[model samples]
Target: SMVNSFSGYLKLTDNVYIKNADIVEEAKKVKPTVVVNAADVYLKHGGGVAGALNKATNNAMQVESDDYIATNGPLKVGGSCVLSGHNLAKHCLHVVGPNVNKGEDIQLLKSAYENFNQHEVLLAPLLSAGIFGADPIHSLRVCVDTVRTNVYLAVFDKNLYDKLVSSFL
Candidate 1:
């Protein structure tokens, strides 16, 4: 059955999970110590997971992002910055995934997940998916292997979850 929401997880490893939930909603459900925003290098609230999270935080996410960009300029691909999660999560880790479809996509994607690994109980979206154009399954594989801590990959699409179930099973 296809639905907009369902609470389920495929434990690919003891420390990794592929969850069927909205990215922002999963943060609310799991109440992780930190959540990730699959952000652009410029940290603009350009639509997709980044825009959704920005709206959830009432644009405060963008405000902090702007301040960070002002001081640091664009975050390098695979690099990240942390900001307050406002009234939601305790902290938000903004990661810039590589938009380049070059061979480096795999390495850079892994690095983004690795950066997020330092946090406890992380909730994240499939980095580089959607507008960034990385294959969700490839991104998922990268996340599964790269993050050694407890993490839930809260993906919004059920079809993707079904596909994940097939491959992970």
Candidate 2:
């Protein structure tokens, strides 16, 4: 006779990595040609990873992003890439995921993932954090497992970062 049970699940990855990093500091070291910044449709880098990048750059990213919003008429959440650069990276790929009311937009997150894939290597922050409302871990999983490419994720959260590493082990 045999016992029946069902209580395990599996996850996989390829060309993706995570770091429990100062995010900003690690990104500066990695110097990925492109880095992602999650923001409003207006490209406001006021908080989260966006704010950190913006602060480190003396508000340069914020200025350019605001201008882009003024000129291009807002990003329309999950819109195209805006080539805004900061001291943190050679290029900043701005992505917008509506607001918390819409909840976690895996689709918008995936759209950002596609932009990251276009480059040789991309720097990622927890895009679904802040106002986007997707649990940081879930966001990381969706991007890591959904897209196939070289990505360096800078995780500001310690526990979540450790958990991801264990998942790999």
Candidate 3:
């Protein structure tokens, strides 16, 4: 199992690593088998806002694939990376946060949670297939409050919010 969020700057080099110590520490705590960083390749090529949006939407489609089972990095809409996991899991879960420009820190957190939730939904079929019985809808509301509260506390700086929003827009 894996959990992560999305970001454009995450994939600049082959051995990509987070500059954020907090994020790295947290990921260490999770002890994920592998960590993937979402680099902002789609934003390049003078794509402007329109091109970025197109890439973002395309990335969303890939996230829904059955091959994607494990979680990694805050995977944004447009980016690249190498993934590894169990034979049963083919693809990786890239948690798209939010458009950097429009998303406040809170929004970023919300987007991360949304990606996490989406991964859970994707896991339903796998669980059901592997086990005799699984109910996807059983724990629908359990994490909503936690997500909301975290976002409320996470969003603070307007300047940071603007930067993030503009990156995706």
Candidate 1 per-residue C-alpha lDDT over 34-151 given as tens digits, one digit per residue, 9 for 90 to 100: 8889888899987999999989888999998899899989988899998888756889888888775544455788888888778757778888987788888888888877888777
Where is the poorest 10-residue window by lDDT in model 2?
1-10
- For model 2, residues 1-169, the per-residue Cα lDDT tens digits are 1221111212234566666677677656656677778767767777787788889889888788777768778776655565756677788878675455676456677675566666656667766665567767666766775557666677777787777667654
For model 3, residues 1-169, the per-residue Cα lDDT tens digits are 2334423222212222112222233233433333222223222212322222224345442343223324443335422333432221233333332334443232333334443332332211111100112121211122242222111111123453344334421
Better of 2 and 3 by lDDT: 2
Best by lDDT: 1
Better of 1 and 2 by TM-score: 1
* Overall local distance difference test of candidate 1: 0.80
Clashing pairs in 1: none
Regions of candidate 1 where Cα sits further than 4 Å from its true position:
1-7, 101-104
Which stretches of model 2 miss by more than 4 angstroms? Answer: 1-12, 101-106, 167-169
The pairs that clash in candidate 2 are: none
In order of TM-score, best first, we have 1, 2, 3
Per-candidate Cα lDDT values, in order, are 0.80, 0.67, 0.28
Candidate 3 versus the native: TM-score?
0.24
Q: Tell me how many residue pairs clash in candidate 3.
A: 13
